[PDB]
Design an enzyme around this catalytic site. Structure first.
Site, PDB file in Angstrom:
ATOM      1  N   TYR A  81       0.812  -1.252   0.052  1.00 41.96           N
ATOM      2  CA  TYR A  81      -0.023  -0.056   0.062  1.00 41.96           C
ATOM      3  C   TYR A  81       0.818   1.131   0.091  1.00 41.96           C
ATOM      4  O   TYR A  81       1.120   2.125   1.051  1.00 41.96           O
ATOM      5  CB  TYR A  81      -0.775   0.083   1.477  1.00 41.96           C
ATOM      6  N   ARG A  86      -1.293   8.011  -3.961  1.00 39.30           N
ATOM      7  CA  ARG A  86      -2.321   7.028  -3.316  1.00 39.30           C
ATOM      8  C   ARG A  86      -3.430   7.766  -2.894  1.00 39.30           C
ATOM      9  O   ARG A  86      -3.577   8.907  -2.301  1.00 39.30           O
ATOM     10  CB  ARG A  86      -1.473   6.576  -1.917  1.00 39.30           C
ATOM     11  N   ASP A  87      -4.511   6.904  -2.703  1.00 38.84           N
ATOM     12  CA  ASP A  87      -5.860   7.318  -2.170  1.00 38.84           C
ATOM     13  C   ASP A  87      -6.433   8.803  -3.289  1.00 38.84           C
ATOM     14  O   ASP A  87      -6.544   9.725  -2.643  1.00 38.84           O
ATOM     15  CB  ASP A  87      -5.683   8.095  -0.668  1.00 38.84           C
ATOM     16  N   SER A  93      -4.587  12.608   1.295  1.00 41.76           N
ATOM     17  CA  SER A  93      -3.835  11.089   1.422  1.00 41.76           C
ATOM     18  C   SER A  93      -2.382  11.151   2.299  1.00 41.76           C
ATOM     19  O   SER A  93      -1.905  12.289   2.166  1.00 41.76           O
ATOM     20  CB  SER A  93      -3.665  10.599   0.041  1.00 41.76           C
ATOM     21  N   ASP A 133      -8.041   0.357  -2.434  1.00 44.95           N
ATOM     22  CA  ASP A 133      -8.392   1.704  -3.108  1.00 44.95           C
ATOM     23  C   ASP A 133      -7.326   2.327  -3.787  1.00 44.95           C
ATOM     24  O   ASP A 133      -7.157   3.795  -3.761  1.00 44.95           O
ATOM     25  CB  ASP A 133      -8.629   2.618  -2.040  1.00 44.95           C
ATOM     26  N   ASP A 312      -8.763   5.348  10.807  1.00 48.29           N
ATOM     27  CA  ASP A 312      -8.713   5.559   9.708  1.00 48.29           C
ATOM     28  C   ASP A 312      -8.350   7.029   9.140  1.00 48.29           C
ATOM     29  O   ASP A 312      -8.072   7.120   7.885  1.00 48.29           O
ATOM     30  CB  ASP A 312     -10.117   5.239   9.165  1.00 48.29           C
TER      31      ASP A 312
END
Length: 364
Positions: A81, A86-87, A93, A133, A312
Site C-alpha cells: 500500500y 495514493r488515495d 492522502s 482503494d 482510519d
C-alpha cells in the site's frame, strides 16, 4: 489450491505491541484486559504503508522462519500500500510518494525492496493484499481530477507489483473494494473488465490468486435482511457481491478466488448513516476470526486485513492530511492520524465483538 489451507496465520508483534503497550495499560476492567490480551493473538495483516515498514516485513518473516524451523507451519500476511498519488479520491492522502515527484520510480524501488525480501524468505508462504482503494477508484472516480491523472501510473505500478511478486511462495489478492462500491450492478461490467485486464496484461501470473474485498470496511459477509443504508443495491453483503462478480471475471479469463476482511464487521447493521461513510465508523465490532473454513467455494479465507484499533484518519480539521469523512457524525471522535492507535475505537470493537472475547470458555 487454497493458499490459506495447510498453514496457520502469523499474529505479528507490531499489533501485539500496540495492544500490550498502548491499550492494556489504559483498560481498568480485569475482564476487558483479558479480552484485549486475546485479541492481540488474532492474526491480522501487517501494512507496508511506507518504505520504512519494509524492515518490519523482513523482521516478521525472520520470526516466522524461526517458528517454522521450530515446527510451525505459519504464513505471513502483508498489505502492499504505497502507490504514488495514493488515495487519489481524497481531500487528503497520507501517501509518501507523488507521481509528479519521481513517484513511479520510488514505487519501483518499493516493489523491488519487497521482492528481495520475499525471495530471501522463499521458504515462507507470503499472503499479500495488493493496493487497497486503487483500482476501484479507476472504475468509479475518473471524474475526480487526481484519479483521472493517476490512471497510467496506477496501471503500470500494479502491473509491476503483480509481475515482480509472482513467486512460488506468494499468493496475491488485488484489492477490489466492497459491495457498496463495486457491487452495484452498474459498476460490475466495468470493474470486471478492468480487473481481468490487469490479470491478463500481467500474463496471468500464477501467484495472482484473486481479489480481496471489504478491506477496511464493515459489510456483512451474509445477512438475511439488507441494512437500510444498502438500498437499493441488490448486492447488499459481500457474499452477494462476490457471487455476482466472480462469474464476470471468470467469463473474461480470470478465475479469481477471494478473501474477505471480517475484522470490523461483527456488529450489523453498523452505525453508518450512508454506505459511503468509511472512517472510524461507530457501532462496529470485531468479526469472524480468521479462517480458511469459510463454507464457500469462492472464498479462500475470512481474514482481518485492517487492524482494529488503528485509526482510519484524523478528525482534527486543522491537521495534515484531514479528510472530511473523518469528522462525520457516524465517525468516532476525536480520532488520531490514520494508522495511529485509537484507544476508544479499540474498546468499541472489543465491546461489540462477535464472536465475543469476553466470553470465558475454559475446561479442565
Amino acid at each position: 489450491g487454497n493458499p490459506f489451507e495447510g498453514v496457520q496465520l502469523w499474529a505479528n508483534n507490531y499489533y501485539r505491541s500496540e495492544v500490550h503497550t498502548l491499550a492494556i495499560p489504559q483498560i481498568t476492567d480485569p475482564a476487558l484486559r483479558a479480552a484485549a490480551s486475546a485479541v492481540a493473538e488474532v492474526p491480522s495483516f501487517m501494512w507496508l504503508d511506507t518504505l520504512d515498514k519494509t524492515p518490519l516485513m523482513e523482521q516478521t518473516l525472520a520470526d516466522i522462519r524461526t517458528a517454522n524451523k521450530n515446527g510451525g507451519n505459519y504464513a505471513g500476511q502483508f498489505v502492499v500500500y504505497d502507490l504514488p498519488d495514493r488515495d487519489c479520491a481524497a481531500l487528503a492522502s497520507n501517501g509518501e510518494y507523488s507521481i509528479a515527484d519521481g513517484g513511479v520510480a520510488k514505487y519501483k524501488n518499493y516493489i523491488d525492496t519487497i521482492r528481495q525480501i520475499v525471495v530471501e524468505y522463499s521458504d515462507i508462504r507470503t499472503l499479500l493484499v495488493i493496493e487497497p482503494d486503487s483500482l476501484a477508484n479507476l472504475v468509479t472516480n475518473l471524474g475526480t481530477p487526481k484519479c483521472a491523472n493517476a490512471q497510467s501510473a496506477y496501471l503500470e505500478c500494479i502491473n509491476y507489483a503483480v509481475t515482480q511478486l509472482n513467486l512460488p511462495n506468494v499468493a496475491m489478492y488485488l484489492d477490489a473494494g466492497h459491495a457498496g462500491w463495486l457491487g452495484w450492478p452498474a459498476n460490475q461490467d466495468p470493474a470486471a473488465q478492468l480487473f481481468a485486464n490487469v490479470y491478463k496484461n500481467a500474463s496471468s501470473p500464477r501467484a495472482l490468486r484473486g481479489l480481496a474485498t471489504n478491506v477496511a470496511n464493515y459489510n456483512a459477509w451474509s445477512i438475511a435482511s439488507p441494512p437500510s443504508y444498502t438500498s437499493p443495491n441488490p448486492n447488499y453483503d459481500e457474499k452477494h457481491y462476490i457471487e455476482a462478480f466472480a462469474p464476470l471475471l471468470r467469463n473474461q479469463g480470470f478465475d479469481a478466488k477471494f478473501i474477505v476482511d471480517t475484522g470490523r464487521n461483527g456488529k450489523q447493521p453498523t452505525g453508518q448513516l450512508e454506505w459511503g461513510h468509511w472512517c472510524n465508523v461507530k457501532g462496529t465490532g470485531f468479526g469472524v476470526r480468521p479462517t480458511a473454513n469459510t463454507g464457500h467455494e469462492l472464498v479462500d479465507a475470512f481474514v482481518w486485513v485492517k487492524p482494529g484499533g488503528e485509526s482510519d484518519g484524523t478528525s482534527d480539521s486543522s491537521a495534515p492530511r484531514f479528510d472530511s469523512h473523518c469528522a462525520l457524525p457516524d465517525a468516532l471522535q476525536p480520532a488520531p492520524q490514520a494508522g495511529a492507535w485509537f484507544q476508544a475505537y479499540f474498546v468499541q470493537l472489543l465491546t461489540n465483538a462477535n464472536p465475543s472475547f469476553l466470553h470465558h470458555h475454559h475446561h479442565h
